[PDB]
């Protein structure tokens, strides 16, 4: 997790993209960009605000749903269900 | 055929001798519940030099019981025994595992031959 | 296999104090297991020629280097042992004085898709590719020095 | 319908015959990905045409053909099931990924099976044994239908030997004869001692296959004991088993001191064939 | 229970005349023989059963001298007795979680039953009482010379249910060893005795059982079996001060001057015992 | 605890007489054999277990001489003990971050446990405690001549549960080796002993355990097992002066010319030890 | 070809309390009963000239090759040792004969009296042919 070091600063984007494995994006109501790493950890950014998520803990995935906009949550219902079975 | 009367290997000859003795006992005393192979196979393969002499005594008795009847095979088995023991200088005190396997091979080879009609 | 390259040290500070420089292959993330799917029992014949560069000497002539290479190949001499890509795969090489032997794919025209042609070190180590088609078991790449293949 | 297609392609026919819509010239792609911690690696990749790869799969299934041991077993064994039978405890994990890569590879390319295959199944036969605790009613066979099919396929492809689909009483081949002899000895044992905890298949199969000279004497003596008991008790005519031993031992001149891996495979195939042809002879 | 404080090793010599010392369950009933040399064998379990029988006969089920395996009993019932005597529930297939109770049940088993205390036992069943290794161990008995088992035919002048000749309407089989002198080795371990409680009175009773082991074992097929020599090596300390194989090599058996023909009596063999090492005392009066 | 300063190689010769030196979990309980040749095998793990048992017996859990792989211990609990002794909070899967703390915990485990100090251990469990290689290693033991295991069938006069099977007694069987002489090779590494603390007193105790390994391991399946010869090669420097395979070849084992038929006692074999190189010496006094 | 054997082993103690609720584990251990391995290697003098690899380094390298396994003992490797080490020393700074033709001179086969699977180095007989005129041959073992 580097989001704690750089908080909402844009340089977090630079650091993540420098160290991150394959990046994904979402175009559903509000633009979202996903930076995924090893250790099943993903960093998600939109403007300055960002949220850190862990893919092995349910609570992190629920919070990722809560941190997203409503219309995005509907499109991510499929993806969210995928991570949630990690037990 | 499969039987090789020219092998002259001591385990092979001992197996053949055991087979012919069993056949002689079977002919002389029909209806017996147990044959020689059922009784003395373990002892014969363990220490041949300690039990083959008494096996030969019993075989001689069995051949004696057969020669009396006008149907005289007895003589055939006796000649077989002459030939088989001809090639043996002395009985083995013990037989190795492979030697015991060859003993069984020779016994089964000889036994089938004596079953020919 | 190992995760990362060894970093450049400054020799001067190496004994401003006793500094044990080492790399621990077995320590945590340093150990990276890499699976390789590789060829077996390969056999090739390479046709190549020469070209003089800008920094060629006033007396250097293509014939001299050609004869040097031919002599080395005939005698088996080599600057370093050639390998089939990775150093742990040594190459046994000969010079074909006679005809190229018949290929296994003599009657096939197999398309291998785009594959690396070379790396252009002048244009900042930029790779350039070509569409490789194995006609009759022989591949005819375009010259890697031509201007229409380079950007 | 899938069963009909498999039967047709195994026999060497064309799939178009069973149904006409296939255009066999369309080329088919198969990709296999193997994972690790966070990145996944390509394991194999084939691009042959539908017709060609269908023919290759048919040839593979033709080579795998063996008489099923029980009526409930698949006629066309699944690749996963075959691989699972080489696993340490016959479960999906413990399957060596390299063997799997060499299957679903040698299967659809027509090339030789990986040389590691035969030692794997032989080692499983060495390590496996009767498992009545499995709650399966039948005492599990050490040389199952799937392992025998794998051995037959390996021998047919990698060694070019001739292996029948069922028992061949005219084979007169020394490893095959030894396998048949082992099968008849086992039958004699389980007839003499009903409900036995373990038979010779559990312990002496490995050494008998690998080193026939050093272990067959004791097996023959034990079978003599078994038949002797079987003769006094009911089923006095033991005589059939003795006759079978005579007919098999007749074609053998010596017990080999050692046997090669392919000879061991032939031994296992012969044992499997003889065992199946002896379940309910009498 | 004051366990013994010394390590022991003993050698027992016994012979059978026209008898069957121990039949082979999987080979008819022939006497056990070495399948390569023909020497006779008597399993350790046979001698242990004879000792158990002697103890039961001479103690008549006295206190602390019961026998566990006994004769056609149900062992799980004995384990249930042990659990009840310890106020525990034997419901689980496992031992009680509290190590103290798991030790208490096994201690009760060892105290009550003599053969558990002496030879040990395995009590891991539906109702579990643990394991005991057994202070006293003895290996296979092996004849000094090869034996030739003999099958003797016998008839009966009566029929069980019905015969087919209603002629040898009944033919039987008897296996006999004309003669064989067997040698049995044994070990007694002080630490295991301390674990189970094998005391000195138990050791004396064990010596008596060894000496008079066969005097009440007579049977139709046993023939005449007798105990001839019993040499006991006693070490001066708990762990012993001499290798076992060195001690057993002191007892030597040879034909002496009666080499004429097969051996047929104990007089055809001569037994001599050498001087024991410094820390070992050899008593042969038994 | 100053570590040793010399490389050692040793060869151990031990017997088995009507016993089962090491069962095979895959082939019922038959003695381990090399199926392609018939030679018997005994896993180095079994010998290490016997050494551990002897150390525990002769030291009775004295300080700095506990054994880590105990009968019923839980390894995570021992690792927790180590962490408590080092005053640390254990992360589940990871060693302490501060490398000196990890070294401290591993050193504590090595110091207070003998078998960790000698044979090493793997402790990367749900409470990680590092790894140790172990200065003392030993390979499989392989019989000089092929063995001929035989099945011994036995019976019991009792039944565990409620059953009407006995109309014949409950069955069972043992597996024994009529006789087999095994050769075990082993190595001791000074460089590893330096990291682990394997001292000279530990070496003396190890030699004693090897010599008296089997004297307290008697059981109903072992028969008579004994260690016959123990040749030790001592090098004069931390790194040896000769390849090990050269040294092991100096110990030649072959059957005595005066013996014929299957081997049945150690007297059937003659063991000769050759001349060692100049940089090595042979302690053929064990 | 080698035929590795699977060896089953057990352990007295269980690692976790969860599995303690019978307290034993059945591991397995793979071994090669015997196998003789041939390793090829190449040393390039021109590359050494760019690195400083000197003759004392070469002697140390030969020593390491001879004594690689004498310090690699462990529970899994069993007994491993170096048996033969043949070195072809070329006269030229470059080579003098093809490497693949030199490696062919080292022929290793089975001894006359050996049959069945190999179980010791005595089963193998190794011979080295006559090298071309431009190269030497050494036997460090």
C23-54 burial code (b ≥16 CB/10 A, e <16): eeeeeeeeeeeeeeeeeeeeeeeeeeeeeeee
Q: Do chains D and E touch (3 or more CB pairs under 8 A)?
A: yes
CA neighbor of G5 nearest in space, from D215, F18, F37: F37
The experimental technique used to determine this model is cryo-EM
Distance CA D57, CA D60 (A): 5
CA neighbor of B40 nearest in space, from B51, B50, B29, B30: B51
CA neighbor of E66 nearest in space, from E47, E88, E82: E82
Using alpha carbons only, give the angle D132, D136, D139 rounded to the nearest 5 degrees. 45
HEC secondary structure over C130-148: EEEEEECCECCCCCCCCCC
- E27–D218: do the CB atoms touch at under 8 Å? no
- E28–D225: do the CB atoms touch at under 8 Å? yes
Distance CA F100, CA F113 (A): 20
E35 closest CB neighbour out of B34, B46, B51: B46
Sign of the alpha-carbon dihedral angle for E106, E107, E111, E116: positive
Q: How far is E73 from chain F (nearest CA, A)?
A: 5
| List of chain D residues whose C-beta atoms are within 8 Å of the C-beta of residue C33 | 36
Question: Residue D16, SS3?
Answer: helix
Q: How far is G45 from chain C (nearest CA, A)?
A: 8
Do residues B15 and B105 lie in contact, with contact meaning Cβ atoms separated by under 8 Å?
A: yes
Do residues D116 and D98 lie in contact, with contact meaning Cβ atoms separated by under 8 Å?
A: yes
F208 touches chain E (CB under 8 A): no
Cβ neighbors of F109 (< 8 A, separation 6 or more) are: F68, F78, F79, F82, F116, F121, F123, F129, F130, F132
- E35–B33: do the CB atoms touch at under 8 Å? no
Cβ neighbors of G27 (< 8 A, separation 6 or more) are: G8, G9, G10, G11
E131 touches chain F (CB under 8 A): no
The radius of gyration of chain D's CA atoms, rounded to the nearest angstrom, is 21
HEC secondary structure over D73-131: CCCCCCHHHHHHCCCCCCCCCCCCHHHHHHCCCHHHHCCCCCCCHHHHHHHHHHHCCCC
Distance CA D245, CA D185 (A): 8
Distance CA D66, CA D150 (A): 9
- D250–B109: do the CB atoms touch at under 8 Å? yes
**Chain centre distance of CA E223:** 18
CA neighbor of D180 nearest in space, from D76, D88, D266, D282: D266
Distance CA F121, CA F69 (A): 9
| Other residues' Cβ atoms within 10 Å of the Cβ of residue C92 | 14
B93 closest CB neighbour out of F146, F148, F261: F261
User: Structure tokens of D105?
Assistant: 């590879």
Do residues F277 and F242 lie in contact, with contact meaning Cβ atoms separated by under 8 Å?
A: yes
| Other residues' Cβ atoms within 10 Å of the Cβ of residue C140 | 11
HEC secondary structure over chain A: CCHHHHCCCCHHHHHHHHHCEEEEEEEECEEEEEEECCCCEEEEEECCEEEEEECCCHHHHHHHHHHCCHHHHHHCHHHHHHHHCCC
User: Structure tokens of D168?
Assistant: 């061949």
Q: Which is it for strands E171-188 and E136-138: parallel, antiparallel or unpaired?
A: antiparallel
Question: Hey, what's the torsion of the CAs at C71, C72, C76, C81, to 10 degrees?
Answer: -170
Could you list the beta-strand ranges (E) of C1-151. 109-120, 126-135
User: Structure tokens of G67?
Assistant: 């004594």
Within 29-88 of C, beta carbons closer than 8 Å to D belong to 33, 35, 37
- C37–D36: do the CB atoms touch at under 8 Å? no
| Other residues' Cβ atoms within 10 Å of the Cβ of residue D274 | 24
F75 closest CB neighbour out of G15, G31, G74: G15
Q: Which residue in the block uniquely carries the two structure tokens 């038979």?
A: D199
Q: How far is D41 from chain A (nearest CA, A)?
A: 15
CB-neighbour burial class of residue F286 (10 A; exposed 0-12, middle 13-18, buried 19+): middle
Distance CA E179, CA E261 (A): 12
Q: Do chains D and G touch (3 or more CB pairs under 8 A)?
A: yes
Distance CA E103, CA B99 (A): 54
Distance CA A29, CA B68 (A): 116
User: Structure tokens of C77?
Assistant: 């001499």
What are the percentages of helix, strand and coil residues in chain E, rounded to 5? 25, 30, 45
Nearest CA in chain F to D222: F151
D257 closest CB neighbour out of G5, G28, G115: G115
Cβ neighbors of D171 (< 8 A, separation 6 or more) are: D164, D177, D270
Sign of the alpha-carbon dihedral angle for B80, B85, B88, B93: positive
- F261–E37: do the CB atoms touch at under 8 Å? yes
Distance CA F194, CA F239 (A): 13
CB-neighbour burial class of residue E24 (10 A; exposed 0-12, middle 13-18, buried 19+): buried
Which strand (E) or helix (H) includes residue F99? helix F99-112
Q: Which residue in the block uniquely carries the two structure tokens 């069987």?
A: F173
Do residues F273 and F251 lie in contact, with contact meaning Cβ atoms separated by under 8 Å?
A: yes
Cβ neighbors of E85 (< 8 A, separation 6 or more) are: E108
> Read out DSSP for chain G?
----EEEEEEESSBS-TTTT----EEEEEEE-S-----------HHHHHTTT--HHHHHHHHHHHHTSGGG---TTT-S------EEEEESSSS-SS-HHHHHHHEEEEE-TT--SS--SGGGEEEEE-PPPTTEEEEE--
Distance CA A39, CA A17 (A): 16
D22 φ, ψ to 5°?
-55, 125
Q: How many helices (H) and strands (E) does chain F have?
A: 7, 12
Distance CA B43, CA C94 (A): 70
Distance CA A60, CA A66 (A): 10
F142-180 burial code (b ≥16 CB/10 A, e <16): bbbbbbbbbbbebbeebbbeeeeeeeeeebeebbbbbbb
The radius of gyration of chain B's CA atoms, rounded to the nearest angstrom, is 14
Cβ neighbors of G78 (< 8 A, separation 6 or more) are: F139, F140, G31
G116 touches chain F (CB under 8 A): yes
User: Resolution (in Å) of the shown entry?
Assistant: 3.0
Q: Compute CA distances D248 → B108, C132, D62, D172, D182, whole Å.
A: 10, 61, 29, 8, 10
Helices D145-158 and D117-127: angle between axes, nearest 10 degrees: 150
Q: Where are the domains of chain A?
A: 1-87
Could you list the beta-strand ranges (E) of E80-214. 121-122, 131-132, 136-138, 141-146, 150-155, 171-188
Length of chain F: 286
Q: Compute CA distances E111 → C18, E55, E108, E232, E282, whole Å.
A: 68, 15, 5, 26, 30
Ramachandran region of residue E220, left (φ > 0), alpha (ψ -120 to 50) or beta?
alpha
Q: Compute CA distances B81 → B20, B63, F95, F171, whole Å.
A: 8, 11, 81, 42
D253 φ, ψ to 5°?
-100, -25
Question: Residue F268, SS3?
Answer: helix
Nearest CA in chain D to B105: D249
Distance CA F83, CA F126 (A): 13
């Amino acid at each position: 997790m580097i989001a704690q070091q750089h908080k909402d600063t844009v340089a977090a984007c630079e650091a993540a993209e420098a160290i991150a494995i394959a990046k994904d994006q979402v175009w559903d109501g509000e633009g979202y960009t996903k930076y995924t790493f090893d250790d099943n950890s993903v960093l998600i950014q939109s403007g300055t605000t960002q949220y850190a998520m862990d893919a092995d803990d349910a609570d992190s995935i629920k919070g990722y749903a809560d941190w997203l906009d409503d219309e995005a949550r509907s499109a991510e219902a499929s993806e969210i269900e995928r991570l949630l079975e990690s037990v | 055929v499969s039987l090789d009367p020219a092998r002259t290997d001591r385990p092979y000859l001992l197996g053949r001798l055991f087979a012919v003795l069993e056949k002689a006992q079977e002919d002389a005393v029909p209806g017996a519940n147990a044959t020689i192979k059922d009784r003395y196979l373990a002892s014969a393969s363990a220490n041949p030099g300690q039990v083959f002499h008494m096996l030969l005594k019993n075989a001689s008795n069995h051949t004696a019981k057969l020669r009396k009847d006008p149907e005289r095979k007895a003589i055939h088995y006796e000649i077989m025994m002459q030939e088989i023991i001809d090639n043996i200088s002395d009985f083995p005190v013990t037989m190795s595992s492979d030697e015991q396997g060859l003993f069984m091979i020779g016994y089964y080879h000889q036994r089938k031959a004596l079953f020919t009609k | 296999e190992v995760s990362s390259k060894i970093p450049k040290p400054n020799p001067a500070t190496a004994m401003r104090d006793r500094k044990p420089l080492y790399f621990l292959v077995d320590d945590g993330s340093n150990r990276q297991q890499r699976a390789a799917t590789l060829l077996r029992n390969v056999d090739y014949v390479i046709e190549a020629h020469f070209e003089l560069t800008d920094k060629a000497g006033a007396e250097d002539n293509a014939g001299k280097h050609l004869d040097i290479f031919r002599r080395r190949a005939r005698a088996g001499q080599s600057f370093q042992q050639p390998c089939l890509g990775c150093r742990e795969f040594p190459a046994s090489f000969e010079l074909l004085e006679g005809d190229v032997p018949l290929s296994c794919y003599a009657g096939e025209k197999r398309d291998l898709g785009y594959m690396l042609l070379d790396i252009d070190f002048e244009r900042d180590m930029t790779p350039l590719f070509f569409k490789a088609v194995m006609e009759d078991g022989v591949i005819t790449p375009p010259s890697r020095t031509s201007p229409e293949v380079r950007a | 319908r899938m069963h009909d297609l498999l039967v047709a392609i195994r026999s060497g026919k064309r799939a178009t015959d069973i149904m006409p819509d296939m255009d066999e010239s369309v080329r088919f792609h198969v990709l296999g990905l193997s994972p690790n911690a966070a990145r996944l690696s390509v394991r194999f990749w084939e691009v042959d045409t539908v017709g060609h790869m269908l023919d290759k799969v048919g040839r593979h299934y033709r080579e795998l053909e063996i008489i099923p041991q029980f009526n409930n077993e698949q006629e066309f064994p699944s690749l996963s099931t075959l691989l699972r039978q080489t696993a340490v405890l016959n479960k999906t994990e413990n399957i060596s990924p390299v063997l799997a890569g060499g299957l679903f590879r040698a299967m659809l390319t027509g090339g030789p099976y990986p040389q590691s295959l035969l030692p794997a199944v032989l080692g499983r036969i060495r390590a496996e044994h009767a498992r009545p605790e499995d709650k399966s009613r039948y005492r599990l066979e050490v040389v199952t239908y799937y392992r025998a099919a794998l051995i037959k396929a390996y021998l047919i492809r990698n060694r070019k030997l001739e292996v029948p689909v069922s028992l061949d009483p005219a084979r007169t081949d020394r490893p095959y004869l030894l396998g048949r002899l082992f099968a008849v000895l086992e039958k004699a044992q389980e007839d003499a001692v009903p409900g036995a905890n373990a038979t010779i298949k559990d312990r002496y199969l490995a050494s008998a296959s690998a080193n026939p000279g050093q272990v067959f004497h004791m097996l023959l003596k034990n079978a003599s004991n078994h038949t002797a008991k079987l003769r006094k008790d009911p089923e006095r005519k033991a005589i059939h088993y003795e006759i079978m031993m005579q007919e098999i031992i007749d074609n053998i001149s010596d017990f080999p001191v050692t046997m090669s891996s392919d000879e061991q495979g032939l031994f296992m195939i012969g044992y499997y064939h003889q065992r199946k042809a002896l379940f309910t002879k009498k | 229970m004051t366990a013994i404080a010394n390590r022991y090793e003993f050698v027992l010599l016994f012979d059978v005349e026209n008898g069957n010392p121990n039949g082979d369950p999987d080979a008819g009933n022939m006497p056990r023989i070495d399948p390569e040399t023909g020497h006779g064998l008597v399993t350790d379990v046979c001698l242990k059963r004879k000792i158990r029988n002697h103890v039961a006969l001479t103690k008549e089920g006295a206190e602390r001298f019961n026998i566990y395996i006994q004769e056609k009993a149900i062992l799980n019932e004995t384990h249930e007795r042990a659990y009840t005597a310890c106020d525990l529930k034997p419901e689980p297939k496992k031992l009680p979680k509290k190590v103290e109770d798991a030790k208490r049940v096994t201690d009760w088993m060892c105290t009550n039953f003599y053969d558990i205390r002496t030879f040990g036992a395995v009590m891991t069943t539906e109702v579990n009482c643990g394991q005991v290794r057994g202070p006293v161990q003895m290996a296979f008995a092996r004849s000094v010379e090869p034996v030739v088992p003999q099958e003797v035919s016998i008839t009966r002048m009566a029929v069980t249910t019905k015969a087919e000749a209603e002629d040898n309407r009944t033919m039987g089989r008897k296996h006999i060893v004309p003669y064989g002198l067997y040698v049995a080795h044994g070990f007694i371990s002080a630490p295991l005795a301390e674990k189970t409680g094998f005391s000195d009175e138990d050791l004396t009773l064990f010596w008596d059982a060894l000496v008079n082991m066969f005097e009440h074992d007579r049977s139709a097929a046993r023939g005449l079996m007798s105990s001839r020599k019993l040499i006991v090596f006693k070490h001066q300390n708990r762990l012993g001060n001499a290798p076992a194989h060195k001690l057993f090599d002191l007892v030597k058996v040879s034909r002496a001057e009666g080499s004429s023909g097969p051996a047929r009596s104990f007089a055809d063999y001569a037994v001599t015992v050498g001087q024991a090492p410094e820390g070992v005392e050899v008593k042969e009066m038994l």
